[PDB]
């Protein structure tokens, strides 16, 4: 007989390679273990991925709160970069800026150095409330089992 779902094309008369690549043992965090070109793990290894991610976060910190901040009025005021007008580009007085790449305000997301901000913050809702596993105001599963065992027909 045939055992189905072998995963081997030659068993099913399907095209396949003849020499399969060997599997090297190397890992990249935020990457995978598999065949790679020579020097790939050294040049773009876990160190590369992690340090690049750290740089990306440090650059996110300015980007998240991107905007022209001015104290000319006597208080710190934020104005979108889109407000600025640029000479020498004909009709387009107002030109794309970083907000084009990162439209936080359009979606109503209050970004911050850390991902979430005051207006847009993770919401923690307490599930327990005032309930108790037994002999509580809330009628729990254990309460149901106790009542059932003490019930009277």
């Amino acid at each position: 007989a045939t055992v189905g779902f072998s995963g081997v094309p030659s068993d099913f008369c399907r095209p396949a390679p003849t020499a399969f690549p060997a599997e090297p043992a190397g890992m990249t965090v935020f990457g995978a273990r598999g065949p790679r070109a020579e020097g790939h793990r050294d040049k773009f290894g876990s160190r590369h991925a992690a340090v690049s991610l750290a740089c990306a976060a440090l650059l996110w910190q300015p980007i998240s709160q991107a905007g022209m901040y001015s104290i000319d009025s006597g208080s710190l005021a934020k104005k979108s970069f889109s407000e600025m007008e640029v000479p020498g580009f004909g009709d387009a007085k107002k030109v794309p800026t970083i907000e084009s790449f990162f439209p936080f305000t359009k979606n109503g997301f209050d970004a911050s150095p850390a991902l979430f901000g005051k207006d847009s913050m993770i919401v923690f809702e307490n599930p327990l409330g005032k309930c108790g596993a037994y002999a509580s105001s809330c009628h729990t599963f254990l309460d149901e089992m106790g009542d059932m065992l003490k019930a009277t027909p």
């Binding site: 040049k43 340090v51 740089c55 022209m68 901040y69 001015s70 104290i71 000319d72 208080s75 710190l76 007008e85 640029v86 000479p87 020498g88």
Partner: protein
Amino acid sequence: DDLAVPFLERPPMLDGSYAGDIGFDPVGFSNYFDLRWLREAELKHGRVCMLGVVGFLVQEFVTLPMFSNGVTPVDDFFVVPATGLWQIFFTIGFVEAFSNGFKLTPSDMFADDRAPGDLGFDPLGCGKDPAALARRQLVEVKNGRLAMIAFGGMLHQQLLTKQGVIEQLTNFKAIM
């Protein structure tokens, strides 16, 4: 001899040949890109920023008769005619092309193996002396880095306070 970051190993590609090399490459850009290209970029940034700092200082006090004066040097740019700005841009492009000999890309910029930052510009012949050449290479790179940071600071603080650098220093107001 001393390393910029003692707890990190000296980067492999930084062997001290270039001026100002204190083994500072913690993120290892030299392991990805050609160090000649990186040093050319560093020197170009530093020179542009040295000129930019001197311009920030002069523009706040002295304005050319043909142009109008903005409140701050960053606003002088918006005040000045757009055609004039375009002319400056195209002149800079022509200068770059001619100085690099129409070898403007990483592929061919150093095809003749010219020293990074060496565009043959020495009208007064200041760098004829070798020892003076080395000392002035160190001075150039250090002053260029300091001017890079200083131009960033001047740009951002001028945009914030809406007052020139010296005007801000004379009338310093805390942001909050």
